[PDB]
Amino acid sequence: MLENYARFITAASAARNPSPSMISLAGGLPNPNMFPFKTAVITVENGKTIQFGEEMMKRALQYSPSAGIPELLSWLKQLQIKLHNPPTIHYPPSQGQMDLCVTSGSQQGLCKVFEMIINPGDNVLLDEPAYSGTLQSLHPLGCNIINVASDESGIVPDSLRDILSRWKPEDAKNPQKNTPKFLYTVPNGNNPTGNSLTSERKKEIYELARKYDFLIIEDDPYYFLQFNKFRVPTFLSMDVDGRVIRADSFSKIISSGLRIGFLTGPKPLIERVILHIQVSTLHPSTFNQLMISQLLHEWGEEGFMAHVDRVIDFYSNQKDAILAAADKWLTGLAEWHVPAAGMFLWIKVKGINDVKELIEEKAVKMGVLMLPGNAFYVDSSAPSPYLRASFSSASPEQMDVAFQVLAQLIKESL
Amino acid sequence: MLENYARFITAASAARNPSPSMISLAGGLPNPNMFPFKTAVITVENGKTIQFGEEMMKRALQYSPSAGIPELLSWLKQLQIKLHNPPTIHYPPSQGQMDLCVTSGSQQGLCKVFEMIINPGDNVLLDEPAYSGTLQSLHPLGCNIINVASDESGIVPDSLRDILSRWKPEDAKNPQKNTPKFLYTVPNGNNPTGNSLTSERKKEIYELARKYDFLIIEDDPYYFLQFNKFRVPTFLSMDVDGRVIRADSFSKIISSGLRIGFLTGPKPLIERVILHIQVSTLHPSTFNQLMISQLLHEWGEEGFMAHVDRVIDFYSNQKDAILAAADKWLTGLAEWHVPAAGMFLWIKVKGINDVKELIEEKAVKMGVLMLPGNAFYVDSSAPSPYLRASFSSASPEQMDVAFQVLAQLIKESL
Ligand SMILES: *Cc1c(COP(=O)(O)O)cnc(C)c1O
Ligand SMILES: *Cc1c(COP(=O)(O)O)cnc(C)c1O
């Protein structure tokens, strides 16, 4: 039941109801034999070709369960246990028993989670600069976003401690005190900053979240792109309270265009999210789930982790290329921290108040496109000296050209 | 864009903002080279094979525009023009210029439309019995659902006229008065009833929508499954005012499991749906959209309509089969109408109050299920004499078996 999670949940979310030998005339499935696609053959780099014969193609073209197809869900649960060993797998449902939901990309799960929790006027916690997409999702919900200080190691727990001191810990379960519903964070390779939390910080933030009793929403699309070969423990692995909701993405690792992600957290909150899925998308593409599931079952955890290693090596090499181009052209004209994960470099330009002018007007003129930092803040009209540079795609030639131009422009703009 | 649809739009919906030079480092795309699927071949029955070579696979696995791929959108826009010729294609944006959105199933779009529109306390109109999935969607949004009488030709205009008589026409644009936001209907082959609106009723209803200035939400997943070979004009075809939002579905025709449908309507409302999508699913599967696009462009409008004709002929034979089975076993035991479209027969059992015990314990034993009517009403705890029978899949033999058992169980309680 919802009873320990009710203070977190909206009146509308709580109001949702399920909306999913034997000759049955009771179902509402169309006839699959009418669908025009018949068989599929899918090629896999140095891998086993995936084949959908006639009967698997009928499955793939047909409706399937809201939470995901059972083979994928089971594979992903075992993955989570192997990687995070969450203490909640062993608890009753009311106490936050770990559960998982395949979603249509990890943004879908996150959005349904924000929609589940937020009433207008609710207080929520995040560190700016934050992903512009999360900001635009929170804005129409009408909550006050309360900014927590961050630095090259993510959220500074001293700043969080100081923000929360405006309440008493005893206020949390008092329905008349507007204590924070949650803290939102991207712990690995934050977009735009590139910075990651340390485990020391995570342990410290987790104790605060216990002390003031709010949820941690751990949005982690670069979990599998950490450049340090030992991965940092997640909030999920330390979640003794069942207060963590985790969003994982295949968008950087397997495919972004396939729209397959997954949400993991306390069963009663996952159930709310699934009930919302049941009246919207109904489920993620059955076809794309079968493609991924067949790949992952043939790979095993081991083949999966080898591919992740391969992808990390590529991004590591790209990261070294962009840092060298920056060392070359931008030293003394700008500041940046080495990215700990992900695909972005966050550059603070010296001696210029707002950089938006410099990029939109002048850089474009020169055939170079960087992104200004403005859209990563709650007040995006405030001036910004930062720009986000992507290193996922550019060649070393193109990075060299891009930074000469940026160097030229920094200097000309004084 | 908004001011004259603002009256229909929630506060949250209107607050949403957009959330989507030879060298660009400004982009947020992962490298598609890292994704493990390299090429794909999908066969089409008596059609040309769909091939994703190396470069088209990279595109299929990558993010794409929130409203859909440009080639699917243009092909669908030309389809709507051919089938419906909406008055609205020539209007400026603000006055409701026709626009289209590809969605992850037609239900995603419907859900985003209800959410975009409804504030707690709002009045909405519809006819019961209605789709249980629609009812579960509306329930948590807190609106007053006002039932409109329907019969075997669908919504009865005189009932609509009488209900609306409780409001003044000139209160519609009074912000302080709570006139109906919209009429929701499924005008071909309503699930569960199988009945369809006639064009005369459509004209009448449209004129009422104009008089009381509400929107029509035309949810039309069986439009391509009409058993009269000449299709009824749609609300979209007569939409001089730009007050019609139309949801189309490929689910019954091409594939339910690919999660591709689309929404047509006034650009300012479609714009609101898109902005919601940009912070949730982001877009529908690029892979699935490209498979469908290749299919449709190769077929052209003619191959598409020939395919549709074959699906109608198939379902039309199932309809005949289930009707014969009904005549054989149920004459003088039940009442039903012949379905005008869709895949359901709706049966009233005579001389019984609630079928729920009759089916969900007594008939399950003999190995037969049909859906009790309760879930198709706003108050599902009320007793129902009705059963919904699907004819999409069962063979004529299994139909005989189910109606034999049904006939028997009714005898055992007459
Ligand atoms: C890349 C990324 C994602 C992934 O989006 P999906 O919906 O999983 O495709 C989510 N959040 C951030 C901040 C990202 O950078
Ligand atoms: C079958 C059906 C649909 C189809 O939904 P998709 O999201 O397009 O699969 C929608 N509404 C009703 C009433 C239906 O019966």
PDB file of C-alpha atoms in Angstrom, chain A residues 76-301:
ATOM      1  CA  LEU A  76      17.356  -5.757 -15.794  1.00  0.00           C
ATOM      2  CA  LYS A  77      16.506  -6.711 -12.185  1.00  0.00           C
ATOM      3  CA  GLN A  78      19.448  -9.142 -12.070  1.00  0.00           C
ATOM      4  CA  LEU A  79      21.627  -6.425 -13.548  1.00  0.00           C
ATOM      5  CA  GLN A  80      20.574  -3.987 -10.763  1.00  0.00           C
ATOM      6  CA  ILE A  81      21.233  -6.574  -8.056  1.00  0.00           C
ATOM      7  CA  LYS A  82      24.611  -7.515  -9.472  1.00  0.00           C
ATOM      8  CA  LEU A  83      25.647  -3.808  -9.722  1.00  0.00           C
ATOM      9  CA  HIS A  84      23.902  -2.117  -6.758  1.00  0.00           C
ATOM     10  CA  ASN A  85      22.727  -4.907  -4.460  1.00  0.00           C
ATOM     11  CA  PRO A  86      19.915  -2.698  -3.101  1.00  0.00           C
ATOM     12  CA  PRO A  87      19.027  -3.397   0.521  1.00  0.00           C
ATOM     13  CA  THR A  88      15.328  -3.066  -0.318  1.00  0.00           C
ATOM     14  CA  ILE A  89      15.066  -6.159  -2.489  1.00  0.00           C
ATOM     15  CA  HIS A  90      14.430  -7.965   0.816  1.00  0.00           C
ATOM     16  CA  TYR A  91      11.708  -5.639   2.280  1.00  0.00           C
ATOM     17  CA  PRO A  92       7.845  -5.859   2.166  1.00  0.00           C
ATOM     18  CA  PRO A  93       6.102  -3.738  -0.602  1.00  0.00           C
ATOM     19  CA  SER A  94       4.747  -1.077   1.864  1.00  0.00           C
ATOM     20  CA  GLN A  95       8.377  -0.614   3.093  1.00  0.00           C
ATOM     21  CA  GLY A  96       9.789   0.170  -0.341  1.00  0.00           C
ATOM     22  CA  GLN A  97      10.608  -3.249  -1.878  1.00  0.00           C
ATOM     23  CA  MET A  98      12.745  -2.626  -4.994  1.00  0.00           C
ATOM     24  CA  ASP A  99      10.798  -2.705  -8.209  1.00  0.00           C
ATOM     25  CA  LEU A 100      11.516  -1.836 -11.822  1.00  0.00           C
ATOM     26  CA  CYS A 101       9.582  -0.519 -14.840  1.00  0.00           C
ATOM     27  CA  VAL A 102      10.754  -0.354 -18.490  1.00  0.00           C
ATOM     28  CA  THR A 103       9.888   3.115 -19.736  1.00  0.00           C
ATOM     29  CA  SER A 104       9.980   4.794 -23.127  1.00  0.00           C
ATOM     30  CA  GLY A 105      13.344   6.425 -22.523  1.00  0.00           C
ATOM     31  CA  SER A 106      14.401   7.438 -19.037  1.00  0.00           C
ATOM     32  CA  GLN A 107      12.926  10.974 -19.397  1.00  0.00           C
ATOM     33  CA  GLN A 108       9.483   9.436 -19.457  1.00  0.00           C
ATOM     34  CA  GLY A 109       9.971   7.772 -16.082  1.00  0.00           C
ATOM     35  CA  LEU A 110      11.399  10.952 -14.616  1.00  0.00           C
ATOM     36  CA  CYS A 111       8.583  13.123 -15.845  1.00  0.00           C
ATOM     37  CA  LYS A 112       5.950  10.725 -14.500  1.00  0.00           C
ATOM     38  CA  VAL A 113       7.851  10.781 -11.176  1.00  0.00           C
ATOM     39  CA  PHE A 114       7.853  14.641 -11.055  1.00  0.00           C
ATOM     40  CA  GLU A 115       4.159  14.645 -12.037  1.00  0.00           C
ATOM     41  CA  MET A 116       3.391  12.033  -9.308  1.00  0.00           C
ATOM     42  CA  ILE A 117       5.014  14.127  -6.543  1.00  0.00           C
ATOM     43  CA  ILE A 118       4.663  17.824  -7.269  1.00  0.00           C
ATOM     44  CA  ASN A 119       1.836  20.054  -6.115  1.00  0.00           C
ATOM     45  CA  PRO A 120       2.087  23.796  -6.943  1.00  0.00           C
ATOM     46  CA  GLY A 121       4.071  25.582  -4.173  1.00  0.00           C
ATOM     47  CA  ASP A 122       5.998  22.388  -3.228  1.00  0.00           C
ATOM     48  CA  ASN A 123       9.711  22.883  -2.409  1.00  0.00           C
ATOM     49  CA  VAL A 124      12.294  20.889  -4.271  1.00  0.00           C
ATOM     50  CA  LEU A 125      16.014  20.688  -4.146  1.00  0.00           C
ATOM     51  CA  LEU A 126      18.604  20.651  -6.971  1.00  0.00           C
ATOM     52  CA  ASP A 127      22.073  21.944  -7.792  1.00  0.00           C
ATOM     53  CA  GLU A 128      22.399  24.445 -10.668  1.00  0.00           C
ATOM     54  CA  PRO A 129      23.601  24.330 -13.439  1.00  0.00           C
ATOM     55  CA  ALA A 130      21.175  21.540 -14.165  1.00  0.00           C
ATOM     56  CA  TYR A 131      20.004  19.872 -17.365  1.00  0.00           C
ATOM     57  CA  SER A 132      17.787  22.343 -19.237  1.00  0.00           C
ATOM     58  CA  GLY A 133      15.214  19.618 -19.923  1.00  0.00           C
ATOM     59  CA  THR A 134      14.668  18.881 -16.225  1.00  0.00           C
ATOM     60  CA  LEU A 135      14.291  22.639 -15.610  1.00  0.00           C
ATOM     61  CA  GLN A 136      11.626  22.948 -18.336  1.00  0.00           C
ATOM     62  CA  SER A 137       9.762  19.951 -16.921  1.00  0.00           C
ATOM     63  CA  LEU A 138       9.726  21.338 -13.349  1.00  0.00           C
ATOM     64  CA  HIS A 139       8.780  24.901 -14.300  1.00  0.00           C
ATOM     65  CA  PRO A 140       5.196  24.319 -15.384  1.00  0.00           C
ATOM     66  CA  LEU A 141       4.592  22.204 -12.241  1.00  0.00           C
ATOM     67  CA  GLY A 142       4.738  25.370 -10.038  1.00  0.00           C
ATOM     68  CA  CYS A 143       7.145  24.231  -7.306  1.00  0.00           C
ATOM     69  CA  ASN A 144       9.876  26.383  -5.824  1.00  0.00           C
ATOM     70  CA  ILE A 145      13.187  25.103  -6.905  1.00  0.00           C
ATOM     71  CA  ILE A 146      15.714  25.656  -4.166  1.00  0.00           C
ATOM     72  CA  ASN A 147      19.314  25.788  -5.444  1.00  0.00           C
ATOM     73  CA  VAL A 148      21.984  23.807  -3.584  1.00  0.00           C
ATOM     74  CA  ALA A 149      25.640  24.837  -4.101  1.00  0.00           C
ATOM     75  CA  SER A 150      27.899  22.543  -6.181  1.00  0.00           C
ATOM     76  CA  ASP A 151      31.609  22.416  -7.199  1.00  0.00           C
ATOM     77  CA  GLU A 152      33.913  19.964  -9.041  1.00  0.00           C
ATOM     78  CA  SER A 153      32.642  17.145  -6.760  1.00  0.00           C
ATOM     79  CA  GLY A 154      28.925  17.828  -7.179  1.00  0.00           C
ATOM     80  CA  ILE A 155      26.506  18.858  -4.483  1.00  0.00           C
ATOM     81  CA  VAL A 156      28.317  20.342  -1.462  1.00  0.00           C
ATOM     82  CA  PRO A 157      26.699  18.701   1.614  1.00  0.00           C
ATOM     83  CA  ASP A 158      27.475  21.768   3.746  1.00  0.00           C
ATOM     84  CA  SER A 159      25.256  23.892   1.471  1.00  0.00           C
ATOM     85  CA  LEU A 160      22.481  21.275   1.704  1.00  0.00           C
ATOM     86  CA  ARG A 161      22.817  21.171   5.480  1.00  0.00           C
ATOM     87  CA  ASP A 162      22.536  24.936   5.549  1.00  0.00           C
ATOM     88  CA  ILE A 163      19.437  25.030   3.266  1.00  0.00           C
ATOM     89  CA  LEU A 164      17.618  22.367   5.277  1.00  0.00           C
ATOM     90  CA  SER A 165      18.292  24.134   8.635  1.00  0.00           C
ATOM     91  CA  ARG A 166      15.353  26.362   7.718  1.00  0.00           C
ATOM     92  CA  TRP A 167      13.177  23.461   8.848  1.00  0.00           C
ATOM     93  CA  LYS A 168      13.134  21.232  11.839  1.00  0.00           C
ATOM     94  CA  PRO A 169      13.625  17.520  11.054  1.00  0.00           C
ATOM     95  CA  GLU A 170      10.266  16.944  12.878  1.00  0.00           C
ATOM     96  CA  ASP A 171       8.479  19.076  10.267  1.00  0.00           C
ATOM     97  CA  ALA A 172       8.918  16.397   7.547  1.00  0.00           C
ATOM     98  CA  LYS A 173       5.929  14.264   8.510  1.00  0.00           C
ATOM     99  CA  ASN A 174       3.886  17.283   9.623  1.00  0.00           C
ATOM    100  CA  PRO A 175       1.422  17.861   6.753  1.00  0.00           C
ATOM    101  CA  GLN A 176       1.398  21.602   7.591  1.00  0.00           C
ATOM    102  CA  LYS A 177       5.127  22.197   7.023  1.00  0.00           C
ATOM    103  CA  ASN A 178       6.254  22.646   3.386  1.00  0.00           C
ATOM    104  CA  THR A 179       9.457  20.603   3.800  1.00  0.00           C
ATOM    105  CA  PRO A 180      11.230  19.491   0.517  1.00  0.00           C
ATOM    106  CA  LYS A 181       9.639  16.525  -1.337  1.00  0.00           C
ATOM    107  CA  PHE A 182      12.893  15.536  -2.906  1.00  0.00           C
ATOM    108  CA  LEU A 183      16.446  16.209  -3.910  1.00  0.00           C
ATOM    109  CA  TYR A 184      17.140  15.776  -7.630  1.00  0.00           C
ATOM    110  CA  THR A 185      20.684  15.016  -8.852  1.00  0.00           C
ATOM    111  CA  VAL A 186      22.659  13.670 -11.726  1.00  0.00           C
ATOM    112  CA  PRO A 187      25.486  12.089  -9.750  1.00  0.00           C
ATOM    113  CA  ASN A 188      27.722  10.977 -12.649  1.00  0.00           C
ATOM    114  CA  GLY A 189      28.807  13.378 -15.371  1.00  0.00           C
ATOM    115  CA  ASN A 190      26.185  16.067 -14.782  1.00  0.00           C
ATOM    116  CA  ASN A 191      24.807  17.788 -17.894  1.00  0.00           C
ATOM    117  CA  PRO A 192      26.215  20.437 -18.408  1.00  0.00           C
ATOM    118  CA  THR A 193      29.078  20.436 -15.906  1.00  0.00           C
ATOM    119  CA  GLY A 194      30.747  17.034 -16.334  1.00  0.00           C
ATOM    120  CA  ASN A 195      31.271  16.803 -12.574  1.00  0.00           C
ATOM    121  CA  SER A 196      30.491  13.687 -10.462  1.00  0.00           C
ATOM    122  CA  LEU A 197      29.675  13.164  -6.765  1.00  0.00           C
ATOM    123  CA  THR A 198      32.187  11.275  -4.593  1.00  0.00           C
ATOM    124  CA  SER A 199      31.002   8.338  -2.404  1.00  0.00           C
ATOM    125  CA  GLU A 200      31.899  10.364   0.698  1.00  0.00           C
ATOM    126  CA  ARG A 201      29.469  13.055  -0.441  1.00  0.00           C
ATOM    127  CA  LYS A 202      26.762  10.592  -1.339  1.00  0.00           C
ATOM    128  CA  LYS A 203      26.928   9.004   2.170  1.00  0.00           C
ATOM    129  CA  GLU A 204      26.700  12.469   3.697  1.00  0.00           C
ATOM    130  CA  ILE A 205      23.735  13.577   1.425  1.00  0.00           C
ATOM    131  CA  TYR A 206      21.991  10.261   2.185  1.00  0.00           C
ATOM    132  CA  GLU A 207      22.185  11.019   5.975  1.00  0.00           C
ATOM    133  CA  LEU A 208      20.659  14.449   5.393  1.00  0.00           C
ATOM    134  CA  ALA A 209      17.868  12.889   3.293  1.00  0.00           C
ATOM    135  CA  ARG A 210      17.201  10.543   6.220  1.00  0.00           C
ATOM    136  CA  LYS A 211      17.401  13.354   8.792  1.00  0.00           C
ATOM    137  CA  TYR A 212      14.934  15.602   6.990  1.00  0.00           C
ATOM    138  CA  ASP A 213      13.129  12.657   5.363  1.00  0.00           C
ATOM    139  CA  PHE A 214      12.878  13.496   1.673  1.00  0.00           C
ATOM    140  CA  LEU A 215      13.280  11.361  -1.463  1.00  0.00           C
ATOM    141  CA  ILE A 216      16.414  11.201  -3.616  1.00  0.00           C
ATOM    142  CA  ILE A 217      15.774  11.142  -7.317  1.00  0.00           C
ATOM    143  CA  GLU A 218      18.918   9.794  -8.855  1.00  0.00           C
ATOM    144  CA  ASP A 219      18.835  10.530 -12.553  1.00  0.00           C
ATOM    145  CA  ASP A 220      21.913   8.624 -13.856  1.00  0.00           C
ATOM    146  CA  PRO A 221      22.087   8.488 -17.736  1.00  0.00           C
ATOM    147  CA  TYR A 222      25.997   8.475 -17.569  1.00  0.00           C
ATOM    148  CA  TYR A 223      26.301   5.738 -14.986  1.00  0.00           C
ATOM    149  CA  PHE A 224      27.846   3.566 -17.736  1.00  0.00           C
ATOM    150  CA  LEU A 225      30.175   6.343 -18.977  1.00  0.00           C
ATOM    151  CA  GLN A 226      32.418   6.912 -15.925  1.00  0.00           C
ATOM    152  CA  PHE A 227      36.016   7.456 -16.940  1.00  0.00           C
ATOM    153  CA  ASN A 228      37.353   6.153 -13.571  1.00  0.00           C
ATOM    154  CA  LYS A 229      37.277   2.354 -14.016  1.00  0.00           C
ATOM    155  CA  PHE A 230      35.931   1.733 -10.492  1.00  0.00           C
ATOM    156  CA  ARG A 231      32.329   2.996 -10.512  1.00  0.00           C
ATOM    157  CA  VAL A 232      31.177   5.161  -7.586  1.00  0.00           C
ATOM    158  CA  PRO A 233      28.537   3.489  -5.330  1.00  0.00           C
ATOM    159  CA  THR A 234      25.027   4.726  -6.162  1.00  0.00           C
ATOM    160  CA  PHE A 235      22.458   6.111  -3.815  1.00  0.00           C
ATOM    161  CA  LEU A 236      20.443   2.995  -4.685  1.00  0.00           C
ATOM    162  CA  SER A 237      23.140   0.663  -3.216  1.00  0.00           C
ATOM    163  CA  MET A 238      22.975   2.506   0.111  1.00  0.00           C
ATOM    164  CA  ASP A 239      19.177   2.939   0.228  1.00  0.00           C
ATOM    165  CA  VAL A 240      18.296   1.309   3.605  1.00  0.00           C
ATOM    166  CA  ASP A 241      15.179   3.541   3.853  1.00  0.00           C
ATOM    167  CA  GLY A 242      13.559   2.950   0.457  1.00  0.00           C
ATOM    168  CA  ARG A 243      13.801   6.713  -0.329  1.00  0.00           C
ATOM    169  CA  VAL A 244      15.595   6.429  -3.713  1.00  0.00           C
ATOM    170  CA  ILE A 245      14.143   6.497  -7.188  1.00  0.00           C
ATOM    171  CA  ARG A 246      16.662   5.777  -9.910  1.00  0.00           C
ATOM    172  CA  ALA A 247      16.420   6.509 -13.616  1.00  0.00           C
ATOM    173  CA  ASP A 248      18.805   4.529 -15.959  1.00  0.00           C
ATOM    174  CA  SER A 249      19.160   5.091 -19.694  1.00  0.00           C
ATOM    175  CA  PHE A 250      20.256   2.995 -22.627  1.00  0.00           C
ATOM    176  CA  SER A 251      20.456   6.164 -24.789  1.00  0.00           C
ATOM    177  CA  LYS A 252      24.232   6.519 -24.608  1.00  0.00           C
ATOM    178  CA  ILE A 253      25.087   2.788 -24.608  1.00  0.00           C
ATOM    179  CA  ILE A 254      22.626   0.873 -26.788  1.00  0.00           C
ATOM    180  CA  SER A 255      20.395   3.374 -28.648  1.00  0.00           C
ATOM    181  CA  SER A 256      18.849   6.758 -27.998  1.00  0.00           C
ATOM    182  CA  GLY A 257      16.378   6.486 -30.921  1.00  0.00           C
ATOM    183  CA  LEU A 258      14.946   3.170 -29.666  1.00  0.00           C
ATOM    184  CA  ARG A 259      13.426   4.995 -26.594  1.00  0.00           C
ATOM    185  CA  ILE A 260      14.120   2.354 -23.925  1.00  0.00           C
ATOM    186  CA  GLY A 261      15.059   3.284 -20.340  1.00  0.00           C
ATOM    187  CA  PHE A 262      14.113   2.040 -16.893  1.00  0.00           C
ATOM    188  CA  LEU A 263      13.068   3.276 -13.526  1.00  0.00           C
ATOM    189  CA  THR A 264      13.906   1.473 -10.213  1.00  0.00           C
ATOM    190  CA  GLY A 265      12.549   2.332  -6.805  1.00  0.00           C
ATOM    191  CA  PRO A 266      10.023   1.541  -4.047  1.00  0.00           C
ATOM    192  CA  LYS A 267       7.202  -0.649  -5.314  1.00  0.00           C
ATOM    193  CA  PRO A 268       4.348   1.634  -4.272  1.00  0.00           C
ATOM    194  CA  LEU A 269       5.905   4.570  -6.295  1.00  0.00           C
ATOM    195  CA  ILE A 270       6.715   2.433  -9.340  1.00  0.00           C
ATOM    196  CA  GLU A 271       3.086   1.236  -9.227  1.00  0.00           C
ATOM    197  CA  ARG A 272       1.862   4.840  -9.414  1.00  0.00           C
ATOM    198  CA  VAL A 273       4.149   5.422 -12.422  1.00  0.00           C
ATOM    199  CA  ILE A 274       2.905   2.201 -14.166  1.00  0.00           C
ATOM    200  CA  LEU A 275      -0.750   3.215 -13.609  1.00  0.00           C
ATOM    201  CA  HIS A 276       0.038   6.505 -15.381  1.00  0.00           C
ATOM    202  CA  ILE A 277       1.762   4.574 -18.233  1.00  0.00           C
ATOM    203  CA  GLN A 278      -1.393   2.471 -18.571  1.00  0.00           C
ATOM    204  CA  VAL A 279      -3.414   5.566 -19.726  1.00  0.00           C
ATOM    205  CA  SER A 280      -0.660   7.178 -21.846  1.00  0.00           C
ATOM    206  CA  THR A 281       1.979   5.282 -23.800  1.00  0.00           C
ATOM    207  CA  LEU A 282       0.561   1.833 -22.671  1.00  0.00           C
ATOM    208  CA  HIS A 283       4.096   0.369 -22.914  1.00  0.00           C
ATOM    209  CA  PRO A 284       7.458   0.822 -24.673  1.00  0.00           C
ATOM    210  CA  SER A 285       7.688  -0.494 -28.243  1.00  0.00           C
ATOM    211  CA  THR A 286       7.372  -4.337 -27.991  1.00  0.00           C
ATOM    212  CA  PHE A 287       9.636  -4.677 -31.034  1.00  0.00           C
ATOM    213  CA  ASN A 288      12.440  -2.502 -29.618  1.00  0.00           C
ATOM    214  CA  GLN A 289      12.220  -4.292 -26.254  1.00  0.00           C
ATOM    215  CA  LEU A 290      12.652  -7.711 -28.010  1.00  0.00           C
ATOM    216  CA  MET A 291      15.627  -6.387 -30.037  1.00  0.00           C
ATOM    217  CA  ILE A 292      17.347  -5.175 -26.810  1.00  0.00           C
ATOM    218  CA  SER A 293      16.425  -8.266 -24.807  1.00  0.00           C
ATOM    219  CA  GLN A 294      17.775 -10.658 -27.425  1.00  0.00           C
ATOM    220  CA  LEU A 295      21.031  -8.667 -27.605  1.00  0.00           C
ATOM    221  CA  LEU A 296      21.388  -8.684 -23.809  1.00  0.00           C
ATOM    222  CA  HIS A 297      20.490 -12.293 -23.239  1.00  0.00           C
ATOM    223  CA  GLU A 298      23.057 -13.382 -25.853  1.00  0.00           C
ATOM    224  CA  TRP A 299      25.676 -10.980 -24.401  1.00  0.00           C
ATOM    225  CA  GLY A 300      25.062 -11.875 -20.758  1.00  0.00           C
ATOM    226  CA  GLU A 301      26.088  -9.438 -18.052  1.00  0.00           C
TER     227      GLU A 301
END
